[PDB]
């Protein structure tokens, strides 16, 4: 079945970072894994024509809901961080996520309306897919960086409640 | 009457560069002036609601049509350029314009569909506006740089008219 080479790669990228840690007692990890799974579904759905219109919109809505969980918890971690440099960096990344996921909903709705509809040009179709691709990459990158920084920050708060256990 | 300051500022910015040269025998200048005018109309159009939907979509369509003229002519100037760097630089900028114009049409349609709609959230309404704003800024900037580089190259293009005539106004 057809899948977006770019969208699926961004999903896998996030999964590789998210997959290593355990979800047990870690809702950042669980939401990030859920986001990467839904993003892999998205790359399939973009390709599909009829009947993919409602699934594409709902998939983006689910990705945005899971990203609110990531953002909410990472903000909590940042607001317990003593180092301003780390606190600011973690707040910078995790505050990009709501904007990107709001933009994912807009661009998925745009792409969904077009799917199977011959009234729009190949140019408009290609740009809509491209805009969606760039948004998916940015979202996956931001969550990956949020996972890394949230873990790094947690050790400091703890050394100086989410569970961070490396998987094998 | 309400206006979108980011959109109007971007329109104003291109207007300042385009109004340096006369439209007489210079299509790119005539197109750049029409683009800045239409972009100023767009800032008014993104605020209002129902009945402004058709106008918002048509305004983006006109901006995109006008931009096709800018890119077609700037590509011609780039191919008359002997300096590898100046034609690469001019091709780099003027080739961004069709993509941004295509994206302006998409995001404009989004914002128009959005106007007078109950389901859309402020976050969605705000993000649709912000995407349109960022697009308008990139478009005006890329046309400004295209005007500037097309004129600069023209002087040197004299290694040997009715379109592409650069007469500095007063
Ligand atoms: O000679 P003319 O008046 O045709 O045009 C000027 C000429 O192209 C200069 O090289 C530009 O230099 P700069 O950008 O002024 O250095 C100048 O820029 P701007 O006045 O168009 O900017 C042009 O006006």
Swiss-Prot record, chain A:
Post-translational modification: Phosphorylated; on serines, threonines and tyrosines. Acetylated; mainly by myristic acid but also by a small amount of palmitic acid.
UniProt-annotated stretches for the region C-terminal tail: 1-168
Outcome following mutation: residue 16 to W: In CMD1W; significantly alters metavinculin-mediated cross-linking of actin filaments
Tissue-specificity statement: Metavinculin is muscle-specific.
Localization per record: Cell membrane; Cell junction, Adherens junction; Cell junction, Focal adhesion; Cytoplasm, Cytoskeleton
Annotated spans, Facilitates phospholipid membrane insertion: 44-87
Annotated disease: Cardiomyopathy, dilated, 1W: A disorder characterized by ventricular dilation and impaired systolic function, resulting in congestive heart failure and arrhythmia. Patients are at risk of premature death. Cardiomyopathy, familial hypertrophic, 15: A hereditary heart disorder characterized by ventricular hypertrophy, which is usually asymmetric and often involves the interventricular septum. The symptoms include dyspnea, syncope, collapse, palpitations, and chest pain. They can be readily provoked by exercise. The disorder has inter- and intrafamilial variability ranging from benign to malignant forms with high risk of cardiac failure and sudden cardiac death.
Domain notes for this protein: Exists in at least two conformations. When in the closed, 'inactive' conformation, extensive interactions between the head and tail domains prevent detectable binding to most of its ligands. It takes on an 'active' conformation after cooperative and simultaneous binding of two different ligands. This activation involves displacement of the head-tail interactions and leads to a significant accumulation of ternary complexes. The active form then binds a number of proteins that have both signaling and structural roles that are essential for cell adhesion.
Protein function: Actin filament (F-actin)-binding protein involved in cell-matrix adhesion and cell-cell adhesion. Regulates cell-surface E-cadherin expression and potentiates mechanosensing by the E-cadherin complex. May also play important roles in cell morphology and locomotion.
Assembly notes: Exhibits self-association properties. Part of a complex composed of THSD1, PTK2/FAK1, TLN1 and VCL. Interacts with APBB1IP and NRAP. Interacts with TLN1. Interacts with CTNNB1 and this interaction is necessary for its localization to the cell-cell junctions and for its function in regulating cell surface expression of E-cadherin. Interacts with SYNM. Interacts with SORBS1. Interacts with CTNNA1. Binds to ACTN4; this interaction triggers conformational changes. Interacts with FLII.
Family per record: Belongs to the vinculin/alpha-catenin family.
Protein name: Vinculin
Range covered out of full length: 960 to 1130 of 1134
């Amino acid at each position: 079945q057809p899948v977006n080479q770019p969208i699926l790669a961004a999903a896998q990228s996030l999964h590789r970072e998210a997959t290593k840690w355990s979800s047990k007692g870690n809702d950042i990890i669980a939401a990030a894994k859920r986001m990467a799974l839904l993003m892999a579904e998205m790359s399939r759905l973009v390709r599909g024509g009829s009947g993919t219109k409602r699934a594409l919109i709902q998939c983006a809505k689910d990705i945005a809901k899971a990203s609110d969980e990531v953002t909410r918890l990472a903000k909590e971690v940042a607001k317990q961080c003593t180092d301003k440099r780390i606190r600011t960096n973690l707040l910078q990344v995790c505050e990009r996520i709501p904007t990107i996921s709001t933009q994912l909903k807009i661009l998925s709705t745009v792409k969904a309306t077009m799917l199977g509809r011959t009234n729009i040009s190949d140019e408009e179709s290609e740009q809509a897919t491209e805009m969606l691709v760039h948004n998916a990459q940015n979202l996956m990158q931001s969550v990956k960086e949020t996972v890394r920084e949230a873990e790094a920050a947690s050790i400091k708060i703890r050394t100086d409640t989410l569970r961070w256990v490396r998987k094998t």
